[PDB]
Design a protein around this ligand. Structure first.
Ligand SMILES: [Zn+2]
Ligand SMILES: [Zn+2]
Lengths: 75, 120, 97, 147, 56, 183, 377
DNA sequence: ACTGTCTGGACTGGTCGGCGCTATGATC
DNA sequence: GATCATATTGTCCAGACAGT
């Protein structure tokens, strides 16, 4: 994606993820959390892993569906 | 903080609050339970009724002529003057001393002479 | 009388099926659902005093702007562990609608 | 000679010093003197020409852990040998903590200080009414110094 | 315009949740059925009032 | 100080009110939510008048209720510092007098009623002066200026209001007319 | 806990060393020119989305500032700083005769050096002026966790079994109290350094007991204690063991047996399993009679119910004494936790879950025996 | 600029049940 | 004979680093 070959481990795609919680949950927890604390990183919780950890709906499947309904509904 | 945001606000006199509380009392009477509102609303309605110095239309017209009379006054102190309805210089002096302005006696006399009409 | 573990792989198949509400019901609603008070000023966890019947944030104050947020108890334990590790997590609250 | 530090078990420095002194007397160790202040916990001072003598003296004792690899200047331990009252160095108006006595683990404010009777009068800060109490000077510990 | 599986599942879940805590059924349903069954019957009858908001 | 405000808010309407009018259900929910509490920014929330505009519903996961953006008018009463009020004494206490000035009752201290060394009379619950010989009783037109406002809690009864009567022009209406007679 | 002397956080030791190498010792500013500072400030805004670019920029800035031995802001000479694991910093100072000797930088000196860094140079060093000050990486106050984070149990013999964190905090408190008492007693500097090193070791083991170059903290029996770092990482950590995956309620597990007579959409559920697992069904107009019959049957008669929830939200257990009273009290809005019936939807899963087909939804079929039934296709 | 060397890390999920282990030396 | 402080400080892959 970034113009260079990247692995799928902690030094590749997961390592350059913008989410702090997703990075810390996979392989390296202490180092990623401390590095985020040093930089004052902000996690926007736009991913799936962070929403799973918190307990919020994931942005996939039915989580991206928005519903509307007209209130004056009668049988 | 009521709601998400506030669009507009307005300062009303005692008579407008009395009319609104009477409307709410009628709405509560239209409801099935015999209690129209809670203790505070009923107490406010009773106080406004016992201090109903002027009609709501009279209060509104006094407010708009007060707005059109002078520019340094605002809606809040105009409604305060409508509710108090002063008749001399001592009361207006002691209610304007703590305000941001200290008006000279001539404009106070003018205010007295315009609010003298349609008074009880 | 223990329960059955819903591991990471089970979460993976639930995600692949696109069932967000089922994931919420399994991992959160049926396992460790709890509610906490979060301060809206500094993001710290507010304190609820049962003696006085009031909720306030001890570090910053803010006796008024306190909101209740539901989440897993494991996440609260993680926040406590992070605070014990001299790391400050600031929870920025957002309206549901 | 040179002052050396021996790390020992906390609260049992006097017995370890006595055992070291007895061993040096019996086996003719080249030990000059041993100093064990009561305020210092877990550490004793032994004067010897070299640290090898201290290492040979303290070995064979379960309660002597190790000798600190360094030499203490005499000015550092000079104030320990001087005799000063525990009440002295305390001024009224500050906050102190009572280490021992019937008021263990209580914060107090110093009210009156007298060096003649070696006693210090303090007032508890957690008490709803001021009740001055008389306590020994060595029992208190200075938390803060104000006025 | 056709409903996706995720959109249909979300609509059925919302309708069943509404039926569970009120929201009387707009069509005749057999007795003893679950609110999920009532929502499924409503979807089969094409009487659902819930729409889907799509990005534009 | 009575105030009228236009407030836009998101209203949650339960499925049991689906068959009713959206405006009526929104008004009922807003009355159940905001009426009867004290707001820090706006003061005492007295009543919800009507709902002007209502938007279409939005369904969020985990809740079957619909959420609507509603515009409504709120009548509120807010006490401010150094604000003159007119009221009637409703309660008498040894430590002061309580005057009903609206949804809340202020407190005037025993030294604060007038420029005299007034003492309390327990038999009739009245204040009797020494030199002025003035008497305060039930149902008296009085005027006072607020000097203390407490917004510590959202409960209206827990909040306290302190007013003064030391200053000239504050007191009973008969006393005010007596003062104006000399001038 | 108010520490008598400041200690270095083991999780920020490399960052502390990097910042010390990249900052002026006495001047306090970053060892970069004003033009270079401006250029890096403009370059930071361009590359902000990708954290890798920010990391490379931080590394480049640190490398550029490390080689500088004279601060451009004040001209003060600088000396190389050597980092020794875990939290030991050495400064290669120069003697009067030109000899090079290593000077140990105490945590107090490190914190004083870090305090002089202005807020403007913090973004260049990868730190936030309001969120992460450089001096906060040197611990002065240690936050002891709540007792809920470190629960204490009692054994069958009455002996309390404290947590590993509790023992580590006991050691930390004891060492800190001894250090404070020795400081108040005017102890020589040699004792002070020894107690400071002991407190630093205890704090480092408390933060992470698996630090390289550190003997791990051991229990009395010889058990290596696990600390806050071990509670988050690993398979049994907070993330993988409790956050990404956890045990759940309303679940069952038993041996499976073939059943060709049922459809592929159906699963055979034991009667004992069905009578234990419950589905909460709200009382509506079209199912009041069925749920009333379920309540009347009770937990011991299939099809029945085990619990009943009133609209107020409280849970009432159903037994023989009160099954009739609850049944005649049932109304719209109540919740009845009835037993599993035919046609109910359940999740059927086999481990390991290699693909998304490992969990599928079936239809409940109640069978008398004790085994799950799955169709052969 | 290459090249060998030091250091850090992760080690497939679930389930079944069992079997230990969570003080001690020195006064008063 | 009862209590009290104290109790120690396994191969392989990838990134960073002295050496030539
Ligand atoms: Zn706060
Ligand atoms: Zn400089």
């Amino acid at each position: 994606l970034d113009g260079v070959i990247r692995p799928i481990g902690r030094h590749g795609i997961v390592g350059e993820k913008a989410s702090v919680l997703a990075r810390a949950a996979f392989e390296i927890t202490t180092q990623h959390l401390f590095a985020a604390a040093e930089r004052g990183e902000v996690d926007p919780l736009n991913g799936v892993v962070e929403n799973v950890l918190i307990g919020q709906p994931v942005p996939v499947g039915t989580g991206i569906v928005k519903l509307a309904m007209s209130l004056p509904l009668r049988p | 903080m009521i709601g998400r945001k506030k669009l507009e606000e307005h300062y009303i006199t005692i008579a407008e609050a009395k009319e609104l509380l009477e409307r709410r009392h009628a709405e509560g009477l239209a409801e099935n339970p015999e209690e129209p509102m809670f203790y505070e609303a009923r107490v406010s309605l009773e106080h406004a009724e016992r201090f109903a110095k002027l009609k709501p239309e009279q209060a509104r017209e006094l407010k708009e002529k007060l707005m059109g009379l002078f520019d340094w006054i605002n809606e809040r102190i105009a409604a305060k003057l409508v509710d108090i309805l002063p008749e001399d210089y001592l009361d207006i002096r002691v209610i304007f001393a703590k305000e941001e302005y200290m008006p000279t006696p001539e404009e106070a006399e003018e205010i007295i002479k315009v609010i003298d009409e349609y008074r009880p | 009388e223990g329960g059955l573990r819903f591991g990471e792989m089970e979460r993976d198949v639930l995600i692949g099926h696109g069932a967000a509400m089922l994931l919420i019901e399994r991992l959160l609603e049926e396992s460790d659902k709890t509610e906490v008070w979060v301060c809206e000023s500094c993001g710290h966890l507010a304190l609820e005093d049962k003696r006085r019947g009031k909720v306030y944030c001890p570090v910053c104050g803010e006796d008024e702007r306190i909101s209740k947020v539901e989440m897993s108890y494991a996440f609260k334990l993680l926040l406590d562990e992070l605070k014990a590790m001299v790391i400050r997590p600031s929870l920025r609250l957002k309206d549901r609608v | 000679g040179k002052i050396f530090t021996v790390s020992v078990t906390v609260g049992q420095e006097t017995t370890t010093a006595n055992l070291i002194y007895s061993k040096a007397k019996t086996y003719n160790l080249p030990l000059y003197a041993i100093l064990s202040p009561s305020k210092v916990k877990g550490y004793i001072f032994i004067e010897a020409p070299n640290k090898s003598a201290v290492e040979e003296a303290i070995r064979g004792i379960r309660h002597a852990k190790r000798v600190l690899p360094g030499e203490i200047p005499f000015s550092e331990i000079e104030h320990f040998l001087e005799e000063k009252p525990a009440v002295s160095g305390f001024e009224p108006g500050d906050i102190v903590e009572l280490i021992a006595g019937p008021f263990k683990g209580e914060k107090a404010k110093v009210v009156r200080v007298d060096e003649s009777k070696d006693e210090i009068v303090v007032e508890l800060v957690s008490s709803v009414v001021p009740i001055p109490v008389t306590v020994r000077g060595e029992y208190v510990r200075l938390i803060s110094k104000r006025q | 315009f056709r409903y996706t599986r995720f959109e249909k599942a979300r609509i059925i879940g919302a309708r069943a949740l509404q039926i569970a805590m009120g929201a009387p059924v707009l069509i005749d349903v057999p007795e003893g059925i679950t609110p999920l069954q009532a929502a499924l019957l409503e979807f089969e009858k094409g009487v659902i009032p819930i729409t889907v908001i799509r990005p534009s | 100080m009575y105030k009228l405000l236009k407030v836009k808010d998101v209203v949650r309407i339960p499925p049991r009110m689906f068959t009713m009018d959206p405006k009526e259900a929104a008004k009922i929910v807003l009355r159940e939510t905001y009426e009867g509490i004290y707001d820090r920014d706006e003061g005492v929330v007295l009543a919800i008048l009507d709902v002007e505009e209502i938007s279409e519903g939005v369904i969020v996961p985990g809740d079957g209720a619909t959420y609507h953006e509603a515009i409504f008018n709120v009548l509120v009463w807010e006490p401010r510092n150094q604000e003159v009020v007119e009221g009637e004494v409703v309660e008498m206490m040894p430590y002061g007098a309580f005057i009903r000035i609206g949804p809340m009752d202020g407190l005037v201290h025993i030294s604060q009623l007038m420029d005299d060394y007034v003492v309390f009379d327990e038999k009739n619950r009245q204040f009797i002066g020494k030199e002025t010989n003035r008497v305060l009783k039930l149902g008296d037109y009085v005027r006072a200026r607020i000097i203390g406002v407490s917004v510590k809690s959202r409960v209206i009864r827990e909040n306290k209001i302190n007013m003064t009567m030391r200053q000239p022009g504050l007191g009973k209406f008969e006393w005010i007319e007596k003062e104006k007679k000399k001038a | 806990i108010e520490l008598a002397r400041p200690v270095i956080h083991v999780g920020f030791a490399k960052t502390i060393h990097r910042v010390l190498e990249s900052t002026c010792r006495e001047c306090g500013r970053i060892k970069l020119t004003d033009e270079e500072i401006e250029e890096y400030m403009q370059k930071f805004e361009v590359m902000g989305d990708r954290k890798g670019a920010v990391d490379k920029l931080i590394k480049e800035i640190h490398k550029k500032a490390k080689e500088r031995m004279v601060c451009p802001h004040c001209g003060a000479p600088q000396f190389p700083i050597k980092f020794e694991r875990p939290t030991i910093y050495w400064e290669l100072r120069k003697d009067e005769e030109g000899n090079e000797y290593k000077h140990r930088m105490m945590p107090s000196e490190v914190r004083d050096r870090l305090e002089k860094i202005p807020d403007k140079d913090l973004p260049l060093l990868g730190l936030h002026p309001e969120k992460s000050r450089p001096e906060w990486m040197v611990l002065t106050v240690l936050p002891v966790p709540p007792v809920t984070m470190r629960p204490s149990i009692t054994l069958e013999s009455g002996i309390r079994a404290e947590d590993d964190l509790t023992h580590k905090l006991v050691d930390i408190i004891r060492i800190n109290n001894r250090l404070k008492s020795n400081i108040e007693a005017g102890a020589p500097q040699l004792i002070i350094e020894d107690l400071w090193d002991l407190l630093q070791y205890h704090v480092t083991t408390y933060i992470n007991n698996e630090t390289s170059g550190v003997p791990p903290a051991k229990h009395k029996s010889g058990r290596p204690l696990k600390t806050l770092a071990q509670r988050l990482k690993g398979k049994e950590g907070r993330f993988r063991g409790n956050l990404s995956g956890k045990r759940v309620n309303f679940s069952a597990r038993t041996v499976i047996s073939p059943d060709p007579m049922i459809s592929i959409n159906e699963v055979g559920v034991p009667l004992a399993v069905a009578m234990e697992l419950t589905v909460p069904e709200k009382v509506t107009e079209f199912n009041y009679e069925k749920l009333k019959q379920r309540v009347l049957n009770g937990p011991e008669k299939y099809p029945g119910a085990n619990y009943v929830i009133d609209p107020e939200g409280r849970r009432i257990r159903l037994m023989e004494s009160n099954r009739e009273l609850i049944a005649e009290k049932l109304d719209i809005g109540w919740t009845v936790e009835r037993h599993l019936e035919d046609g109910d939807v359940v999740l059927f899963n086999r481990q390991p879950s290699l693909h998304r087909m490992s969990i599928m939804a079936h239809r409940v079929r109640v069978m008398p025996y004790r085994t799950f039934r799955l169709n052969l296709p």
